[PDB]
Write a protein that binds this ligand. Structure first.
Ligand SMILES: CN(C)c1cccc(CNc2ccc(C(N)=O)cn2)c1
Ligand SMILES: CN(C)c1cccc(CNc2ccc(C(N)=O)cn2)c1
Lengths: 244, 244
């Protein structure tokens, strides 16, 4: 009954599929799953092992302190996910060596109706599997985590927001400050304009604050933008008041 | 019995504390928790409400489509976490408007023995709470998620790796490719040097590959580095071979 149509299917390859309950069972993403706007399906390489101890790691050629994902169980899990996905599924590997995710990249990834996310553990996966099985390698940021599961979940959450029905950044700026009750909090008052009921004055104040915040915190983000006439004016005003 | 000492305590304020099972119950972080190297303690603003329906959101002054976290339950939850933490706990708010996390920032945050992480939902929290309760505002990347929980979990995982006992980036470079069995995979062979047993040749090959990979994928990362004599040489060699 809930209108889908732009529903999204996401296959996940992970040694710890139960981690994905954090997004499939709670909040907005949990609702998206319940309403069939989002489907997350997990395959565990451990289920594709054949030895008694269900071995899923293997030693790197050339030595070193780390292990890699064992090729055969991982490869078989990926092939099974691909078979379930059918035609048109893009296979994504999350790693610190990948293309850096930003909101633009999220909107690009969100254009896919089917994704398969491969979650590496240990020191990652065999380079030849990346060559033969992986379409795109992405990073959620310049830091190292214990597995690709949190990055995969982060990507799912980010793209889920663009699925119709699931739900100032949209303009490439940081957001303005927001206020709610009470009118006075530890001596700090709400900006009078927000309680004026003057919608146009409130819009312009918020936009001016967003411009000022972006300039002060992330000035490089401004360089990437072609500001509107109005934005140029409000930013100039904010900068003048800062130097005043 | 497991040596701790540099153990870390992390308080979390979240409307969905059960999401944090994804890190406290599984993998390396799950082991860290079991071994008392890492403690994660959650407070839910819903438990600090007094009305019949346990209301945790509130309307923004000045209108708009979104809601904010209700101040009183959130504020009381934060104060309770602070009381439990005692002296010296840094309070962190995760938002897209915060300082961008990278590995350097992770190592800085990891110097804290106590952290409190505040997870915003809806359109975030009252600006005056950020002023009065929050020490530092951090972002895990330039994208928007449905809540601060995945960013909080991402930060916990990243900093947990620096807790002694819990466990090429360390040099500011991307990692080299790695290989494991089989020797031939879909016609693709393992680089002969990795099966040569010549440790010095293998080290230099890996370093050269890391330099080449960083140059090709993330050249800006190289600008931030003062390369060693050896790194300058191997990078020059890799670049020469690319133009050859
Ligand atoms: C070489 N190595 C340690 C490694 C290689 C691949 C995957 C993993 C799993 N960890 C991840 C994955 C992604 C990210 C990210 N920033 O998107 C951070 N951590 C580790
Ligand atoms: C204004 N707004 C929508 C908002 C404001 C604050 C928090 C939140 C919760 N969502 C988050 C949190 C952090 C990150 C990050 N990149 O670290 C991404 N999403 C949303």
């Amino acid at each position: 009954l809930v209108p889908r149509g732009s529903h999204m299917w996401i296959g996940v390859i992970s040694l710890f599929p139960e981690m994905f309950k954090a997004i499939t069972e709670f909040g907005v993403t949990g609702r998206a799953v319940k309403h069939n706007l989002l489907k997350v399906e997990c395959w565990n390489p451990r289920d594709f092992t054949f030895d008694k101890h269900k071995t899923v790691d293997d030693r790197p050629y050339g030595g070193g302190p780390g292990m890699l994902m064992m090729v055969q169980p991982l490869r078989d899990a990926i092939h099974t996910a691909k078979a379930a996905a059918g035609e048109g599924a893009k296979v994504i590997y999350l790693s610190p060596q990948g293309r850096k995710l930003d909101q633009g990249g999220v909107t690009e990834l969100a254009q896919n109706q089917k994704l398969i996310l491969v979650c590496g553990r240990y020191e990652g996966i065999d380079e030849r599997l990346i060559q033969t099985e992986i379409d795109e390698e992405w990073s959620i940021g310049d830091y190292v985590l214990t597995g690709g599961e949190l990055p995969a979940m982060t990507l799912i959450d980010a793209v889920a927001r663009f699925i119709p029905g699931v739900l100032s950044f949209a303009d490439g700026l940081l957001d303005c400050p927001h206020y709610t009750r009470p009118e006075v909090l530890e001596g700090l008052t709400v900006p009078p304009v927000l309680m004026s009921g003057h919608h146009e004055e409130i819009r312009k104040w918020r936009l001016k604050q967003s411009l000022q915040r972006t300039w002060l915190r992330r000035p490089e983000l401004l360089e990437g933008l072609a500001l509107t006439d109005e934005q140029r004016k409000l930013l100039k005003e904010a900068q003048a008041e800062h130097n005043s």
